[PDB]
Amino acid sequence: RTALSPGVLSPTRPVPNWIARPEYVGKPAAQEGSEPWVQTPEVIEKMRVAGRIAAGALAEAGKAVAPGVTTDELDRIAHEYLVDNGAYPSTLGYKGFPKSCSTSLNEVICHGIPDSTVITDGDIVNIDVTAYIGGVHGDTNATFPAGDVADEHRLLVDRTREATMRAINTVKPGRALSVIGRVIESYANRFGYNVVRDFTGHGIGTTFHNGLVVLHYDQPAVETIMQPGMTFTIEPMINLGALDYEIWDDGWTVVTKDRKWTAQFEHTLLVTDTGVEILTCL
Numbered sequence: 001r002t003a004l005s006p007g008v009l010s011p012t013r014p015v016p017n018w019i020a021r022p023e024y025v026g027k028p029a030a031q032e033g034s035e036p037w038v039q040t041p042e043v044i045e046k047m048r049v050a051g052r053i054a055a056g057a058l059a060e061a062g063k064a065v066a067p068g069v070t071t072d073e074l075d076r077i078a079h080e081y082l083v084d085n086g087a088y089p090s091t092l093g094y095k096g097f098p099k100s101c102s103t104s105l106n107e108v109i110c111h112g113i114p115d116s117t118v119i120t121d122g123d124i125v126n127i128d129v130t131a132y133i134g135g136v137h138g139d140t141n142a143t144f145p146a147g148d149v150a151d152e153h154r155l156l157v158d159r160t161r162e163a164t165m166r167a168i169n170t171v172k173p174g175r176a177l178s179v180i181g182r183v184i185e186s187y188a189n190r191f192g193y194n195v196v197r198d199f200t201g202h203g204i205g206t207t208f209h210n211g212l213v214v215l216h217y218d219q220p221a222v223e224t225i226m227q228p229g230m231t232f233t234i235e236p237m238i239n240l241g242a243l244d245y246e247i248w249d250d251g252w253t254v255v256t257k258d259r260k261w262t263a264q265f266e267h268t269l270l271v272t273d274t275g276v277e278i279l280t281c282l
């Protein structure tokens, strides 16, 4: 399998006009980055519903992952699942992004665009899906293997999953946010991988990326302490090779410079009075 290149984009999929759009749809930038980090009880309830629906759309599009299938076909399946549930696909028209999820194969770190690219035997495919319903977002991603994936590349996926699940388990009120990046990068570095630095987790509520940043590497200077009612993502991109990367002419797709493969998982988390709740479950 060699250096991916861009296929061709289908036209914008339509969203029935009854489904409420986030404010940024069709605008160049989003109104976000200065929202409260602690959600009201009502916003948290509504986020369990966004969360379950984006977890539905991810499993559904993930079941279609197979040698043969286009990434456009995954986007179609994700788009249709969100729409049939009354959810707007958060990515659609978000800063001009063209599709309803991001599909990121192999040396694509993140933000790959659904197109006519055909998944081949041995590929790894990340599907990243966000839902917007009742005023709030649910955000979640997983890397799926397609056919006979190399051991090297299976170990990578399962170890990225494992990093994310370790990170999540250490989420509790009163503990420092920098504990997440420490657990992740220590797990990663244990097997010689390299955690991506420029791309982060985020606060999420009534907005997509609300200004709260969640580093996936070890950075103790961050003073932020986790509080009950905090809602944020853990979404680590773990690289087999060098951290260096490039961006396609489409201005979205991020690829590793050395073309070595990379994997990611993501969940949307609630900090509770004593623990953690994962909102992006079925």
Ligand SMILES: [Co+2]
Binding pocket: 128, 129, 130, 139, 140, 141, 235, 266
């Ligand atoms: Co995401």
Ligand SMILES: [Co+2]
Binding pocket: 139, 140, 201, 202, 233, 235, 266
């Ligand atoms: Co996210």
Ligand SMILES: [K+]
Binding pocket: 104, 105, 106, 107, 108, 109, 110, 124, 126, 261, 262, 263, 264
């Ligand atoms: K990838």
